[PDB]
């Protein structure tokens, strides 16, 4: 009997209309844990590179993490996977809320969608009962709106709904999937859902979900809760107030946005406004937020309550968390009020709030220089704010220039020509990065930008501090109880690291120290994304309650399989290396692993080469970025190497 995982998946062919429950291999759980890890294994040996994103054979996968549905705090994440229409690489994407737990109580670990439905439909799951319902009456309805109509329809007030808005239905390349206060936002999974004619997935679950060693397990949970209490009485000293505590970035609670508005670039990641955070602005924005924030609310089984319901006058309520609070405001050079308003529309439409704002700022910079004319904007309103509303609607319906813009800055530029390419200056692998254009090369972040498979700086960082402390005393205070470090050497690094001088960036930490740090930071995300654990209590914040030393205990008591610290490291390596193999098979090479040319004012060609050289070797990869035969072998990935040799990816 299986524990923690349900041990079954639902296989659905949207072309035939077929639905089937399948027992999973208990070995794939020992090897790859679950979530992202198992998602990747399925992609690897069911989606060869010949497959397009909007090919019927593309797979759209919904997965509950291995420990979702157990009592573990914050363990509630859904991992959605597919081939991205925008990057043409794997897109995995995470959604919090309450959906993944509900799927586990319904009895399933995943839903694998294949094919295309000729008519718009949605999937309905109530424990053992699974059917495909017609969805044509929901056409073009907002993602949250759709969820409420469906729940009335079926009389399932406690069902959880994941849906696409019109954005997805039109295959916008950065279309999201929305569920209450949660979103699978990036990489266009929303578009693949829409391409398949799938409007929503409704799940209701009332089955039990067991753990292997009950007393041992609830013990660890209580230990985690005790740590959450401690950690909130003790914020990281002298650190930006949003990044001093647990949770996703606490931007719904904290009104201090000095850090963001003064160091991140406005417009099309174009403008620094170093003195933006005045007392006047601070009060205006606080007034706006105080009035807008209805309640701070949590995902399933979590006390951190990072998100908030938002009510603007004359607009339906919606939910928000993290940086989307500022992206529309900063892209449009506007105020907090405007951001909250347009974010409501863009959430209902279902759009990636990181990519959308830059796509629109992108477009207007083109109108500015003349690369686009006024004629390409028929009926372009006069005011700045009206113009973002105007363009948002065109994009979401793919109307005229919107059809182009809806493909993202990379594809839009190469379609427009005339020099638009110069203005798509903030992509890595065809995916928009955060609007950051800093001064001095950061060797740690350099490696994360280049190599992260999520292609998003905010989902690979976290465990190691972003800046050093000026005083030795402060550093010694910090390493003192830093139990999370995989190894004592990370304390020593942070002790030596200084803001200025011999031991300052970009030459210190050393190349090898940077490789160790980035490896650790990324490993914890990959573990989170397999277990279903929210990064807010794990990989994202400093000194989390979940870490490399108690995670193996959680997996052993939870799922009933042997697990220790070293085996967990090797597991996370195994499917992080598998995700790598996938993107390699789809053509990714070292040449693609480069940050935007203007991402730092001060660059060091030779230092950068040594960094990436060294990181690959640590990964056990090529100098081309390909995992090697010997590495694939040690990891239990023999079939990867043999396939790589037959494709000529690796010489024999």
């Amino acid at each position: 009997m299986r524990y923690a995982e349900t041990g079954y998946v639902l296989e659905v062919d949207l072309t035939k209309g077929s639905i089937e429950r399948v027992a999973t291999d208990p070995r794939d759980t020992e090897l790859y844990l679950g979530g992202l890890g198992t998602n990747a294994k399925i992609l690897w040996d069911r989606v060869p590179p010949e497959v397009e994103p909007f090919s019927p054979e593309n797979l759209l996968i919904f997965a509950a993490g291995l420990l979702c549905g157990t009592p573990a705090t914050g363990c509630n994440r859904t991992i959605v996977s597919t081939v991205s229409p925008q990057t043409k690489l794997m897109a995995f994407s995470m959604m919090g809320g309450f959906w993944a737990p509900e799927l586990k109580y319904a009895g399933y670990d995943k839903i694998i969608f294949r094919g295309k439905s000729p008519e718009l439909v949605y999937l309905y799951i109530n424990n053992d009962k699974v059917e495909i319902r017609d969805a044509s009456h929901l056409k073009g309805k907002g993602a949250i709106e759709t969820a409420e109509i469906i729940k009335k329809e079926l009389n399932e007030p406690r069902a959880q709904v994941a849906a696409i808005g019109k954005a997805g239905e039109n295959r916008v390349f950065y279309a999201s999937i929305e569920q209450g206060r949660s979103s699978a936002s990036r990489g266009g999974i929303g578009a693949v859902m829409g391409d398949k004619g799938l409007k929503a997935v409704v799940v209701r679950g009332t089955k039990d979900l067991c753990v292997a060693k009950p007393e041992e397990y609830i013990g660890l949970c209580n230990e985690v809760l005790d740590y959450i209490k401690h950690r909130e009485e003790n914020p990281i000293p002298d650190v930006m107030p949003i990044l001093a505590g647990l949770g996703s970035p606490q931007e719904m609670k904290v009104h201090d946005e000095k850090w963001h508005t003064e160091n991140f670039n406005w417009g099309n990641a174009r403008t620094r406004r170093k003195d933006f955070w005045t007392d006047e602005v601070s009060h205006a924005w606080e007034k706006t937020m105080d009035k807008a924030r209805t309640r701070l609310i949590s995902c399933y089984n979590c006390p951190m309550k990072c998100g908030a319901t938002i009510s603007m006058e004359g607009l339906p309520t919606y939910m928000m968390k993290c940086f989307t609070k500022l992206t529309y405001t900063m892209a449009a050079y506007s105020d907090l009020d405007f951001g909250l308003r347009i974010a409501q529309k863009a959430t209902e439409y279902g759009l990636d709030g990181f990519s959308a704002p830059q796509v629109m700022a992108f477009a207007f910079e083109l109108l500015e220089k003349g690369i686009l004319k006024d004629s390409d904007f028929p009926g372009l309103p006069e005011g700045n704010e009206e113009r973002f509303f105007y363009l948002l609607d065109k994009i979401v319906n793919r109307d005229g220039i919107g059809d182009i813009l809806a493909n993202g800055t990379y594809w839009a530029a190469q379609e427009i020509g005339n020099g638009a390419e110069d203005y798509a200056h903030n992509n890595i692998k065809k995916h928009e990065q955060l609007p950051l254009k800093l001064s001095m090369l950061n060797p740690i972040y350099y490696l994360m930008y280049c190599t992260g498979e999520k292609i998003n700086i905010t989902q690979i960082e976290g465990q190691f501090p972003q800046a050093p402390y000026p005083k030795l005393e402060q550093r010694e205070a910090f390493v003192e109880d830093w139990i999370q470090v995989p190894d004592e050497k990370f304390k020593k690094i942070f002790l030596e690291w200084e803001p200025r001088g011999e031991k300052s960036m970009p030459n210190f930490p050393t190349v090898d120290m940077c490789c160790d740090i980035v490896d650790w930071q990324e490993m914890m995300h990959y573990i989170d994304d397999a277990l279903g654990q929210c990064a807010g209590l794990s990989s994202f914040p400093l000194k989390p309650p979940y870490h490399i030393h108690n995670y193996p205990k959680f997996i052993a008591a939870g799922a009933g399989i042997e697990m220790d610290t070293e085996k967990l490291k090797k597991a996370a390596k195994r499917y992080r290396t598998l995700v790598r193999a996938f993107n390699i098979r789809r053509g990714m090479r070292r040449v693609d692993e480069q940050p935007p040319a203007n991402h730092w004012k001060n660059r060091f060609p030779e230092l950068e080469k040594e960094l990436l050289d060294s990181y690959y070797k640590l990964k056990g990869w090529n100098d081309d970025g390909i995992p090697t035969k010997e590495t694939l072998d040690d990891l239990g990935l023999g079939y990867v190497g043999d396939e790589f040799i037959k494709r000529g990816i690796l010489s024999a």
């Binding site: 549905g69 157990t70 009592p71 705090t73 309450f98 109580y105 949250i144 409420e148 007030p157 209450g180 206060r181 009332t206 089955k207 039990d208 979900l209 067991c210 753990v211 009950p214 007393e215 397990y217 609830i218 809760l225 959450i228 209490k229 209805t294 309640r295 701070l296 609310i297 949590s298 995902c299 399933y300 089984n301 979590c302 006390p303 309550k305 319901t309 339906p316 309520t317 939910m319």
Partner: protein, 161 residues
């Protein structure tokens, strides 16, 4: 005579809707304890509707063998609550406070025997607390009322049952 009355104090203004209370109450009451969990089995159930700003933890009350002739439904301070929205009853009209497999009724016993209500313990924002206080012939009259409304013949015949 002075006996003890226990009150579950529920500050719904502090509830974040996380349902941790449902997780731990069901988990604790699995057999063996913590061997599993399942919110359908929890004796605390949260009315949760973010779009109405409603977050109301509701505890399993008394068993009733039939529904009411009329179900109540409140509008209060602009919020339109659910039909029977505040009822504690383990009732035939719905699934709440009944096993989702056998339909058998559930009762909150304030985690009798334990050091502390587990739902209270896991509610880290402290929306839940439990507190204590001491508290301090008609038959004949009642029996008349019955005769006088249903008739002496009726009352008698029913006594034999």
């Amino acid at each position: 005579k002075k006996r003890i009355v226990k009150t579950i104090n529920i500050d719904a203004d502090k509830c974040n809707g996380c349902r941790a209370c449902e997780v731990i109450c069901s988990a604790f009451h699995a057999m063996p304890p913590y061997s599993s969990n399942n919110p359908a089995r929890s004796r605390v159930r949260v009315v949760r509707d973010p779009l109405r700003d409603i977050y109301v933890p509701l505890y399993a009350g008394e068993y009733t063998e039939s529904e009411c002739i009329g179900r109540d439904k409140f509008i209060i301070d602009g919020k339109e609550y659910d039909e029977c929205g505040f009822c504690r009853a383990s009732c035939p009209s719905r699934d709440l406070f009944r096993e989702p497999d056998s339909g058998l009724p559930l009762k909150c016993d304030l985690c009798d025997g334990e050091p502390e209500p587990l739902c209270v313990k896991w509610c880290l924002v402290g929306a839940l607390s439990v507190t204590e206080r001491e508290v301090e012939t008609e038959m004949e009259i009642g029996l008349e009322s019955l005769i006088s409304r249903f008739g002496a013949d009726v009352v008698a015949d029913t006594v034999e049952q």
